[PDB]
A paper describes a structure:
MurAA catalyzes the first committed step of peptidoglycan synthesis, transferring an enolpyruvate moiety from phosphoenolpyruvate (PEP) to UDP-N-acetylglucosamine to produce UDP-GlcNAc-enolpyruvate and inorganic phosphate. MurAA comprises two domains with the active site Cys119 located in a flexible loop (Ala114–Ile126) that is solvent exposed in the ligand-free state. We refer to the domain containing the active site loop as the “catalytic domain” (residues 21–232) and the other as the “C-terminal domain” (residues 1–20, 233–419).
In order to determine the structure of apo-MurAA, we also attempted to crystallize MurAA without added ligands or cofactors during purification and crystallization. Data were collected up to a resolution of 2.65 Å. Upon inspection of the electron density, we observed significant positive difference density near the thiol group of the active site cysteine (Cys119) and UDP-binding site at the interface of the two domains. This was surprising as we did not add any of the ligands during purification and crystallization. Based on these observations, we modeled the covalent modification at the active site cysteine as a Cys119-PEP adduct and UDP–MurNAc at the interface of two domains in E. faecium MurAA to form the dormant complex. The density for Cys-PEP adducts in all chains was well defined and unambiguous, but the electron density for UDP–MurNAc was found to be weaker and more variable across the individual copies of the asymmetric unit. The observed weaker electron density could be due to a lower occupancy of UDP–MurNAc and may be indicative of partial occupancy. Except for the position of the surface loop (Ala114–Ile126 with rmsd = 2.7 Å) the overall structures of MurAA are quite similar (C-alpha rmsd of 420 residues = 0.6 Å). In our previous study, we also identified a less common G220V substitution during the development of DAP resistance in E. faecium HOU515FΔliaR. Importantly, positions 149 and 220 are proximal to each other at the protein surface but distal to the active site consistent with a potential role in protein–protein interactions. The structures of E. faecium MurAA with FOS–UDP-GlcNAc and by serendipity UDP–MurNAc suggest that, like other members of the MurA family, the protein transitions from an open to closed conformation upon UDP-GlcNAc binding.
Residue numbers in the entry:
A (entry chain D), B (entry chain B), C (entry chain A), D (entry chain E): 1 to 420
């Protein structure tokens, strides 16, 4: 139905405000199920479709969720007896909805959640979630495409994660905060979203230590209460605008940006010639006249974030030389590069390596997004392409970016969103 | 808004008729553009959505195409001056539509075809097509997501294909049949569809030698005429039914099956315990009581066909042990296995290897197809799952299978196609 | 304790003679075990260490082998009762020595051959050899690092190879020529060495059809006799000199070169700017002033030979741009590129891809070969490096090249072989 | 010259003492170059060949090194003017010798170190070392296979490591401790060896903060002095004995073992059925009657250490089912599994994944080690193989294990080391 039309050749200048983090708000909404009494109030909630889906998931568990979009605020009342079922209708749209499994085990000792199927970008199975829950004393059945977890008594244990899975970390944390005794998670996810989740759980009465470090220690408690919490800024939306500034000879202040949440991206953009400055008001990015090539390798935090990879390929594809990207977190997250061949991108892909030759002008063309970050990457490429770029499948964009086109317009970009 | 409902536990018995090959009919329809005079009549044309799309592509080049579905017959009149443009509207639906580029170069010396974008299953770029056309004297421009190829005079040359690409082979053959002098294609595609294409071109007045071998030799001619041609049987539809018989303790005759077009699959099914017999009337497959594990590696013909891989994983997942599949032709063609986790499939994926443990019962669940062959694989899995399987996204199935559910019903399978 | 010293800066000019093929002579020596009566005489046998090793292997089976090095000729008398044991002392030096297993099964119905261990360049297991032998009626035991195969009666059967393994193809052919009835090998190796092996077996009284094609058919016979045979020219030694000419602005005639045995290499060198001509006396290679980049993908014949890959990286590393090589036949055959970093080669490796930037001068340095073809590649790099290159571990070079330095001197190259 | 002979079937019982860490002692020896005045005394130095090589490297820089093997003690006097050259004679034996580059830059502002060549197990280039040194103000030339780094004034800077390279981390830390101002290394190596290096540097008068965390901060100082330091226990030698106990139904106390240095291995061995207990005297491992399969993925610390991978495959290969290992740190570190096919190991390898079927008895055979940890893994496999295992290339074992056979004998293992 809709497309974003982009003309290139304009420098981005000004200030940009950033929404609260998609990847923090979804687990924190699930965390609100832990409050047996009181009203949870979340501030700085972004208006994204994944938030609407998660709000539906939670309502279907017998919970009142009001989203005041104007105030960017969600109130949750989970004080009634919860239902325990999250069907494929919701999990098929968004597999993040499975992080309700942990709170449901803590509250009810029972959860019945649809097994996620395929993802475009080539996701992992939920094996590490289940490993965690089994370690805490849960029995796991599968029938009719559902995972049913039952635990009369959750008991703390030592759990080693083979990979530092963000999702498994979140799911297990939220079960363990009400398990009897000590839980220790080794090789936890260290991402800033984990820290924000830990911060709210602690306010709710939990005891979570070492969030953001290699080892997390959780002391179980009997009762959790509701609190007010402001979602941390979205480091990926921030980073997307940092790339946009760096590739357009821009001068853009990302308001209240937390630089410690983008150490990799900042370092890499500086290697490509950008000047990046921490100021009282946020992080300023000044794009160079000559964009220099650099190689990028994605890894679990604190390495380079996979959620910045697609956006980063856009600037690598206009750099003056050959750049390489290696994706070690996702199996099939180069589909945007396949599309950008329509825009005359010279790129060779083999397995989880892509080789980009940026000594070619990008050309406007009609292009279809394949996933959330691919949509942003195609728009960014449009900022530097010659002619007119038309980006479609904006359903993907809306999952993670609010008012992307308007924020870009306000920075001087020639970007419209229109009907076909 | 349709689904296939499957109950497992039934043995397949009887005879099944197979349609003409999807992968032969699409390039042969393009080949019909070469006939400057006469009416081309194609018989044994399958009723698939890709055929409808290809018929539209060809009409938009100023050609009359009539499809009599009842007779499985298409007449083509390409005797008027051709237009040269194939837009993204069609190429985005089906990238096979680019094989019109070759005939357009031969007839007009001009072609303007949309550059294909991303494919779900992780396709190659069209670099080898363009390499071929440049070798024959074509200039190539890109603008607005179109490849424009201009050739005043096509001149035969020696062309080495880095990979034995079926599509590049087809596109180049069809340009070269009207080039001046000799063309030699080294490391050509050897697939049976190439042979059928060569067979019709030869009847049309062309001189193509060595089709099906490692080296193809083409002597250019001035004029090609229209002919009647019956499309070769679909070896992949045939093979799909061979797998179904082998996994259900079946006894199924695949009518008029060409066994030399399934040497790999036949050999592998026999390794898994099947008895397979060439008869006057076709190939009979008798499924064993104990399905034995086997490993599979996809390769260009004459190795194991990637188009049989998804179907083959279905039988590997009910074999009595661990089986391994290695996909060396496509990057991301294991998404069906991600879905089959909903059906309790125990499978580990890393890169282009998948490890399947078949000592677990499959379970019915709602499952969404991701691509043509994945849809067939999910139905086949349903035949052996306990409970009710519901397969969705039948738009993918209809691209390559005609009346799949009816043919299965006629073999004793409990399969319905119904509205939601 | 020898080294080759190379100074760069000279163009190669002249004629080069090529030895008989290492990869044909080793299996054909094994084939000579099949002759129960008579003296086998092989001509055009190269003086390489692998030939000396194979001659030892065969003597230990109670056979007389005389190597007249001056005449490049080996006589074999295998008319006595054969011993059946080939120990790890020999197989650990050279795993090609296992192709005696096939002839031993045909003559004796018994073979006891050491299981090969690891290879530097990352070889396959011998699973496909054993699959073939089991298919013909052989029982297989493993004990104390030996494979023991017993077959009272070999019986012809259909055998599908999952990969077109040269070694498995050779081993199975040589067992099957004396099996009762018809044998069919599907997805056989198509390499020219297979053809030469088939050619001698046929002269010896066997019936081997379709060698060099996708399907091989063998009709078993009761008796085989000894013959005279001239080994086919070594296409890899030939190809090595073609690369040397192409990278040094050379003009070199490779005497009596069979161009159909280097279709991929010839095509790729022409893509890099070389002019290559079939003449009465052989194949002439004329190197361009400007060496152009090209990408290379190794595959089973008829694709680009892995045995030419290392040599080809040498010319790719001096081409005017970025080139990519993809090795799909061996796991770890880029160790030469790791060494060439000492020569200032700019190359990035990930998995089975290597990315070479040739817009940098190579520099002479002391470098150690890691395997046969790496040794040749380092010498070739020396031809274009600035300064003095010293190549060591010439034990690897002598496995596959006879008088490499002298042949290069005769073409005008500044190459000496000296003691340390 | 020598082999280790192993008979299987015996349970390991007793206490084992562990040497100081190879991977700490080598960089700490290099660190001793920073002391311009005084005598450095290192305690708990293991008697390994890498220590002898490193001692030679350091002497050639005009330094006195005395190794009292009986006291496990090394004194270093680096108070004279240092020479700056480390030739290929030493770097070709052991690429760890390049970590002298950092201290040489700090002391002299000049270093001339041979570029490492190929490694068997498929190492990285030294790009990240050079990136670090360039960031601190060093000029880098390559000529004749040497890297020459010159820096009149080292100046602190922010450095992001694309990969958390242990070697690059060590080299950069040792330069930065004497750079002017603040250095910040982001995505540093977190390994315990880094911590021990930091601990000695701090005692020597340096200011290194955040060792073991994601970010390291270094404040430059003018002068460093000599100290006494006891090398931390070798966590890999410790872990090797933990595996040996776990696979032999053993009961072994690893004296003074630091469990926080083997969180991954301990967790994984417990998943395989072992009982592991922290005691006053160290860590006790009790091997189960039934060894259970588990999957293993190597990663930078704090994930599963690649230096434990080979040893771990030995226990995975006798577990009661199928296990998978994924090696994400090194490209070609599965060569031991290629050898263990001689011992009847059923294993499939593809890329950086290996699939092990442990429902087969291992068999003794002659087997050749390919690298340090492969040698240990083959001995461990011998402990469970039936018959006699003979492990050769003990030159590799001696690089990292002191008196391996004697420590195993003392635990009740049937292990001899003898001449051939
Ligand atoms: C929404 C979603 O499914 N994935 C998103 C995020 O969800 P989050 O709410 O933090 O948690 P989860 O959904 O429960 O977890 C994500 C799903 O994928 C597995 N996983 C988890 C962590 C990891 O590192 N790798 C990995 O594969 C995990 O098992 C679960 O099934 O987790 C990923 C972590 O890398 C993000 O990259 C991704 O962000 C998108 C892409 C973007 O912004 O571009
Ligand atoms: C839709 C269709 O007909 N495609 C099928 C047809 O290829 P073809 O019609 O010749 O192919 P193209 O799309 O016209 O070729 C253009 C596009 O296809 C890429 N390509 C083509 C050939 C090849 O070997 N490898 C390869 O990657 C090329 O890089 C470009 O993106 O036949 C092949 C085997 O015979 C199938 O693998 C292929 O997949 C169908 C769906 C299936 O499952 O049955
Ligand atoms: C000498 C050698 O080791 N093999 C060489 C030779 O095989 P050949 O001598 O005829 O055959 P075998 O070794 O007797 O074959 C038995 C052994 O070789 C493994 N194998 C065999 C075939 C194959 O395709 N792949 C493969 O891995 C099998 O797993 C077993 O260990 O010729 C092949 C192509 O003609 C080369 O690719 C190969 O490279 C050489 C080094 C080169 O650079 O010259
Ligand atoms: C030579 C030696 O002693 N090797 C050890 C170590 O050396 P280090 O003290 O870091 O000295 P360097 O080799 O000069 O290190 C520099 C070079 O080493 C590579 N590197 C280094 C770090 C890393 O994380 N990964 C990585 O690959 C890369 O090539 C780099 O250029 O490097 C590895 C670190 O992961 C260790 O696992 C390895 O231990 C052995 C195997 C064992 O005990 O089994």
């Amino acid at each position: 139905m809709e497309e974003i039309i982009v003309r290139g050749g304009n420098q981005l200048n000004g200030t940009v405000r950033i929404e609260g983090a998609k990847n923090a708000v979804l687990p924190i909404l699930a965390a609100s199920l832990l409050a047996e009494e009181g009203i949870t109030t979340l501030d700085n909630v972004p208006i994204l479709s994944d938030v609407f889906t998660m709000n539906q998931v939670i309502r279907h568990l017998n919970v009142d969720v009001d989203f005041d979009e104007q105030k960017n605020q969600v109130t949750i009342d989970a004080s009634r007896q919860l239902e325990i079922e999250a069907p494929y209708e919701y999990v098929s749209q968004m597999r993040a909805s499975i992080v309700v499994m942990g709170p449901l085990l803590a509250r009810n000792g029972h959860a019945k959640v649809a097994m996620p199927g395929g993802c475009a970008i080539g996701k992992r199975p939920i094996d590490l979630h289940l490993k965690g829950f089994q370690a805490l004393g849960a029995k796991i059945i599968q029938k009719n495409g559902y995972i049913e977890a039952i635990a009369d008594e959750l008991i703390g244990n030592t759990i080693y994660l083979d990979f530092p899975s963000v999702g498994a970390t979140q799911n297990i944390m939220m079960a363990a905060v009400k398990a009897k005794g000590t839980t220790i998670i080794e090789n936890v996810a260290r991402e800033p979203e984990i820290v924000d989740l830990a911060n709210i759980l602690n306010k709710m009465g939990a005891q979570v230590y070492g969030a953001g470090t290699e080892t997390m220690r959780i002391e179980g408690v009997d009762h959790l209460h509701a609190v007010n919490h402001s979602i941390v800024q979205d480091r990926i939306e921030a980073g997307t605008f940092m790339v946009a500034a760096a590739m357009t000879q821009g001068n853009v202040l990302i308001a209240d940006a937390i630089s410690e949440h983008n150490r990799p991206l900042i370092s890499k953009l500086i290697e490509m010639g950008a000047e990046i400055i921490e100021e009282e008001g946020g992080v300023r990015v000044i794009g160079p006249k000559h964009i220099l090539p650099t190689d990028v390798k994605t890894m679990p935090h604190p390495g380079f974030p996979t959620d910045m990879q697609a956006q980063m390929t856009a600037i690598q594809l206009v750099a003056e030389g050959t750049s390489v990207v290696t994706e070690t977190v996702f199996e099939n997250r180069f589909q945007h590069l396949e599309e950008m061949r329509r825009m005359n991108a010279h790129v060779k892909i083999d397995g989880n390596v892509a080789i980009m030759d940026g000594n070619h002008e990008l050309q406007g063309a009609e292009v279809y997004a394949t996933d959330l970050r691919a949509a942003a990457a195609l728009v960014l490429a449009g900022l530097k392409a010659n002619g007119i770029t038309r980006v479609r499948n904006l359903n993907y964009l809306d999952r993670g970016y609010y008012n992307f086109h308007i924020k870009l317009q306000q920075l001087g970009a020639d970007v419209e969103r229109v009907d076909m």
